């Protein structure tokens, strides 16, 4: 239990490590505590990430909806939970993903990647801001 910062609770299994990798959460001097494969109650098994002295905007919290929709984000101060929130699907995913169209201008030029997000038939479709092609989020890779 931390004094101040953020606790990302109810992360599904095998997702916690990916979130660390993807949003580069370990690139800081702040104390981080990670529980993986912990027992839950509402979920059975879960992952858990606590980061001291670090806060997530609503947009940052929304970026998690892609990987942990049912996650809980506790903002914490003076050992107290002073705010709780849930990922709601965001309108855009910027920077972290790589457009899978090999002929897109985003690969050759000094811009950040950017995709519009939409629900499509129990899948999430990503539409590249630049080349406007659309992909299953499954086939849009990270970096």
């Amino acid at each position: 239990a931390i004094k101040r910062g953020t606790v990302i609770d109810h992360i599904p299994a095998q997702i916690g490590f990916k979130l660390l990798s993807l949003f580069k959460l370990t690139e800081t001097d702040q104390r981080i505590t990670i529980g993986l494969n912990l027992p839950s109650g509402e979920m059975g098994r879960k992952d858990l990430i606590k980061i001291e002295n670090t806060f997530l905007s609503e947009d940052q919290v929304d970026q998690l909806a892609l990987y942990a929709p049912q996650a809980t984000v506790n903002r914490i101060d003076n050992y107290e939970v002073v705010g709780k929130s849930r990922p709601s699907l965001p309108e855009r995913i910027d920077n972290v993903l790589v457009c899978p169209n090999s002929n897109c201008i985003s690969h050759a030029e000094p811009v950040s990647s950017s995709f519009a997000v939409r629900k499509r038939a129990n899948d999430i479709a990503l539409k590249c801001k630049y080349c406007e092609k659309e992909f299953s989020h499954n086939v849009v890779l990270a970096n």
């Binding site: 897109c104 201008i105 985003s106 000094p110 499509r120 590249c128 630049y130 080349c131 406007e132």
Partner: protein
């Protein structure tokens, strides 16, 4: 200011039906009553990073008919991007300190969108970005469909050939979907089919479309038969089986065609339209090409002149 004053023209997906009708109305006006000095004191860049005949020459002709000056290049090989390794971003960052608008064609999808992020207050007009969009083609296409059918709603429209890489059909299908009651027939090899983002868009809007294996199936129904070239320069070698036109239209296939039916093709054609079609009253691809002058004059007017024309 008119709705399109100082606007970037990148994708049909960003334009409303009212925008499209505005271009068309302006096109009619300047065709009837040319304003040879409307764009005097404008200097416009024409930057083509891949090949063009119609789009570049009609655009530059349009600029001159409106009194504007033109600078640019038809080939990137002798720009500093071609020989010194400069990015496209830096290229746009400098050119946008020179001119009043940038017309650009480029072999990578999204190049035009990118340019807008570096052109500051200078509008970018997309003359084609890879297999993505071709919004000025659509504008002349719409003008042509209007001219010959008298309307843009409740039409039967067949699109034939390479629908996957046809930036023309991506833009045109999106544009026609903004009108009511239009019906689509897609005649393509499976490997070059219309992309799912286009079909999804249609389904969402409740528009009727169907896949067909032949021109003859739909010939009796169609008002517009839009033929395309296989985009061989876009093909993955895995798709090289499709280089040759799978569907060839000849004069003989036009027997049961409606008297209103026009054959369109954004050009160039290879063999998908036989020369014997040229002489038939259904042939309208050259008329169509000529209409690019009026669509492109109109677009330039609306982007560079704040007042609606008369």
């Amino acid at each position: 200011a008119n709705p399109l004053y100082q606007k970037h023209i990148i994708s049909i997906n960003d334009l409303s039906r009212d925008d499209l009708n505005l271009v068309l109305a302006t096109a009619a006006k300047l065709k009837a009553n040319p304003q040879p000095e409307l764009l005097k004191h404008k200097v416009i860049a024409s930057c083509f990073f891949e090949a063009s005949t119609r789009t570049r020459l009609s655009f530059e002709t349009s600029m001159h008919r409106l009194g504007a000056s033109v600078v640019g290049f038809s080939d990137s090989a002798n720009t500093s991007l071609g020989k010194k390794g400069e990015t496209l971003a830096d290229t746009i960052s400098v050119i946008s300190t020179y001119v009043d608008a940038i017309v650009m064609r480029h072999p990578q999808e999204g190049a035009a969108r990118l340019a807008t992020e570096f052109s500051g207050n200078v509008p970018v007009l997309n003359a084609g970005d890879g297999s993505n969009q071709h919004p000025t083609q659509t504008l002349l296409d719409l003008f042509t469909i209007q001219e010959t059918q008298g309307r843009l709603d409740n039409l039967h429209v067949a699109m034939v050939g390479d629908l996957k890489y046809g930036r023309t059909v991506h833009s045109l299908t999106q544009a026609l979907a903004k009108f009511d009651g239009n019906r689509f027939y897609f005649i393509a090899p499976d490997a070059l089919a219309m992309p799912q983002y286009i079909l999804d868009m249609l389904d969402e809007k409740g528009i009727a479309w169907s896949l067909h294996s032949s021109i003859e199936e739909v010939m009796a129904e169609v008002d517009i038969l839009y033929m395309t070239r296989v985009q061989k320069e876009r093909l993955d070698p895995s798709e090289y089986a499709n280089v040759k036109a799978q569907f060839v239209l000849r004069a003989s296939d036009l027997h049961n065609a409606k008297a209103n039916m026009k054959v369109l093709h954004p050009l160039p054609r290879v063999d998908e339209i036989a020369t014997d079609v040229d002489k038939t009253p259904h042939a309208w691809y050259f008329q169509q090409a000529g209409n690019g002058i009026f669509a492109r004059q109109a677009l330039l007017a609306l982007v560079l002149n704040r007042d609606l024309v008369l």
